[PDB]
Amino acid sequence: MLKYIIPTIMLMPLTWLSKNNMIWVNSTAHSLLISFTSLLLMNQFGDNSLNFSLLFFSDSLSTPLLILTMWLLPLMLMASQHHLSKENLTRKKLFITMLISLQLFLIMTFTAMELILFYILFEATLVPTLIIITRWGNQTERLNAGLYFLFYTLAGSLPLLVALIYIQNTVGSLNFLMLQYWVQPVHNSWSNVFMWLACMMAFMVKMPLYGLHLWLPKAHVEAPIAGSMVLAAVLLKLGGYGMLRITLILNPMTDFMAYPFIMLSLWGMIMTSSICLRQTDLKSLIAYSSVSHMALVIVAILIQTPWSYMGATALMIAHGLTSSMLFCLANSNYERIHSRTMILARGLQTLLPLMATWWLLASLTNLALPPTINLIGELFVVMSTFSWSNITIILMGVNMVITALYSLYMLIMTQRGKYTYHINNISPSFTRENALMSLHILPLLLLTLNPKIILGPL
């Protein structure tokens, strides 16, 4: 509520209004504080969900999901600091403003009270993200990532507004989710498929199916300095949750056609992870993880029958961190050596000993050792999706193999002798290198102690 948007918009002139170089520490100081407010009135119910205003129930829903969104902001200025210190302050004042200008809508969205505040705010980004990709790129291939990032996201999300304005005047008012207490079903026709297909395909083009992901590595391979907005674009994607607000209801009873979204993404899950093994560019190698065990949720959501939402929620915020943090490693190791080519960096682990245990705990949580959230987020997937049909144990059982050769080959490539020609790579990871790389593994594993705070209603 205004408890949140108002201070975080109050942030906005906490920055430029300041002096010279004090700016970074000025806003990083406050931006942490809001996290007390983040929990503050939140983590109330529980049962019979919280709605505190007419057009906002901040998050009740058991999709808390908002606490993270308020984390990643003052993880950027620790992240983004590296080469952004080399241009002017009135531009550096900008890049902190639009970056906030993103953070303000992700608080608006995830609440939205309804469908039609979601959408205009579901499309309300792409103004702030697109401007961070095109400027402050690195290569010159960036200019095409500008377009491809649109012309999909916007391409098929217009058929929403044709459909959601079609519901508003058909049955009552969509003004509120919390009233669905009248919903008739959707039986069949050659019209209703389209309705269901229009109210869906806009979401898929964000969390990729194995088709129409053609943009995802185009934008991430070449993308701002620190992953500065690349950490944010790994929040944006998973935020396609809203399919959890719809497909639960609002055409419940068409599962009839589900199968082309099952067998299409269920054989890609065994697939695009395997086209990730021979990659020669590291920020590509991680970008294809992000498809894979993200695209497993799309076979979690379509199937009804909770024990999937038990396991589908834990995944949106499962790689929400692990897949975040890897883009933070591959950034750092790139500061020192200016190729992103994976081969070139070898013979590390002697020269940066403390950063050894940083790779490991990262690459260990794709392996998903049993105790952490990762498996307890996957093993509620397999338990329901087994009951669907027994044969799902094979493919998604293969996923649990190729992903293990997948991860290690990234670490074990950095255990070798190489002294080779590098006179660079002196800096022994000054604190920010290891400070911002923490505040992930500390908060991540921690939740396993009381992991009832990440769960759906079911």
Partner 1 sequence: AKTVLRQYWDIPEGTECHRKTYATTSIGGAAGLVVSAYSVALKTPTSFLEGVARTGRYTFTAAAIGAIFGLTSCISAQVREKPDDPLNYLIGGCAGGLILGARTRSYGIGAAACAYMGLTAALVKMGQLEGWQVFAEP
Partner 2 sequence: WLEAILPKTISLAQMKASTLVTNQKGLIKLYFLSFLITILISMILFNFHE
Partner 3 sequence: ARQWQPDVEWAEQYGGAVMYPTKETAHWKPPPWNDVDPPKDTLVSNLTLNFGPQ
Ligand X SMILES: CCCCCCCCCCCCCCCCCC(=O)OC[C@H](COP(=O)([O-])OCC[N+](C)(C)C)OC(=O)CCCCCCCCCCCCCCCCC
Ligand Y SMILES: CCCCCCCCCCCCCCCCCC(=O)OC[C@H](COP(=O)(O)OCCN)OC(=O)CCCCCCCCCCCCCCCCC
Q: Is 308 exposed, middle or buried (0-12, 13-18, 19+ CB in 10 A)?
A: buried
191 binds partner 1 (CB under 8 A): yes
The pattern of x and - marking residues 89 through 128 that bind ligand Y according to CB under 6 A reads: -xx-x-----------------------------------
- Told to check if 210 binds ligand Y by CB under 6 A, we report no
Nearer to ligand CDL, 184 or 357 (CB): 357
- Please report whether residue 166 would count as binding ligand Y according to CB under 6 A: yes
Query: What whole-number distance in Å separates Cα of residue 80 and Cα of residue 74?
Result: 10
Least gap, CB of 192 to partner 1 (angstroms): 9
Specify the DSSP class assigned to residue 88.
-
Distances (CA, A) of 3 to 40, 63, 167: 10, 19, 32
Among positions 181, 190, 421, 430, the unique one binding partner 1 when judged by CB under 8 A: 190
Among 3, 5, 37, 168, binds ligand X (CB under 6 A): 5
Structure token pair of residue 106: 């992700």
**Token pair in block for residue 35:** 């996290």
Stretch that binds ligand CDL, among 9-17, 197-205, 272-280, 352-360 (CB under 6 A): 352-360
From the list ligand CDL, ligand X, partner 2, none, pick the one residue 32 interacts with, judged by a Cβ distance below 5 to 8 Å according to partner type: none
Give least dist CB 432 to partner 3, A: 22
Q: Are 228 and 186 in contact (CB under 8 A)?
A: no
Q: Which of 3, 7, 14, 16 binds ligand Y (CB under 6 A)?
A: 16
The identity of residue 291, as a single letter, is: V
Min dist CB 143 to partner 2, Å, is: 14
- The tokens describing 121, both together, are 């705010």
Per-residue binding string, partner 1, 138-177, x by CB under 8 A, is ----------------------------------------
341 forms beta bridges with 281
Closest CA to 320 of 63, 54, 132, 36: 63
Q: Which residues contact 195 (CB under 8 A, 6 or more apart)?
A: 163, 166, 186, 251
Distances (CA, A) of 396 to 270, 290, 430: 7, 16, 41
Query: Between residues 13 and 443, which has the closer beta carbon with respect to ligand Y?
Result: 13
Binder to ligand CDL among 357, 387, 427, 448 (CB under 6 A)?
357
Structure tokens at 412: 């074990």
What span, in angstroms and rounded, lies between the C-alpha atoms of 295 and 297?
5
- Amino acid symbol at 9: I
| Binding flag, residue 137, partner 3 (CB under 8 A) | yes
Integer Cα distance of 52 and 354 in angstroms? 47
Of 70-78, 89-97, 137-145, 267-275, the window that binds partner 3 (rule: CB under 8 A) is: 137-145
DSSP SS3 for 347: coil
Please give the C-alpha separations between residue 356 and each of 67, 336, 343, in angstroms, as whole numbers: 29, 16, 18
Choice between 191 and 420, CB closer to partner 1:
191
Residue with tokens 């100081």: 29
* Cβ–Cβ < 8 Å for 72, 84: no
> Of 55, 194, 30, whose CA–CA distance to 121 is shortest?
55
Which position among 18, 101, 175, 349 is part of the footprint of ligand CDL (CB under 6 A)?
349
- Cα 203 to Cα 157, 324, 402: the distances in Å are 8, 21, 27
Q: What's the min distance (Å) between Cβ of 214 and partner 1?
A: 19
Binding mask 97-136 for ligand X (x = CB under 6 A): --------x--------------x---x------------
Under 8 Å between Cβ of 454 and 64: yes
Tell which residue, 125, 151, 79, 63, has the closest CA to residue 454: 63
List the alpha helices (DSSP H) in 87-157. 89-108, 116-122, 128-134, 142-149
Number of residues near ligand Y (by CB under 6 A): 19
Other beta carbons less than 10 A from residue 280's beta carbon: 11
Q: Which does 183 bind (CB under 5 to 8 A by kind): ligand CDL, ligand Y, partner 1, none?
A: none
Shortest spacing between CB 136 and partner 3, in angstroms:
7
Nearer to partner 2 by C-beta: 214 or 401?
214
Which listed range, 39-47, 135-143, 297-305, 418-426, lies at the site for partner 3 (CB under 8 A)? Answer: 135-143
Q: Which residues bind partner 2 (CB under 8 A)?
A: 211-212, 214
- Cβ-closest position to ligand CDL: 353
Q: Which is nearer to partner 2, 217 or 311 (CB)?
A: 217
Among residues 20, 48, 191, 431, which is the contact residue for ligand Y, using CB under 6 A?
Answer: 191
Which amino acid does the sequence have at 47?
D
Q: Contact between 159 and ligand Y (CB under 6 A)?
A: yes
Q: Which does 124 bind (CB under 5 to 8 A by kind): ligand X, partner 2, ligand Y, none?
A: ligand X
Q: Does 180 bind ligand CDL (CB under 6 A)?
A: no
Binding site for ligand X (CB under 6 A): 2, 5, 105, 120, 124
Q: Which spans of this chain sit near partner 3 (rule: CB under 8 A)? A: 136-140, 142
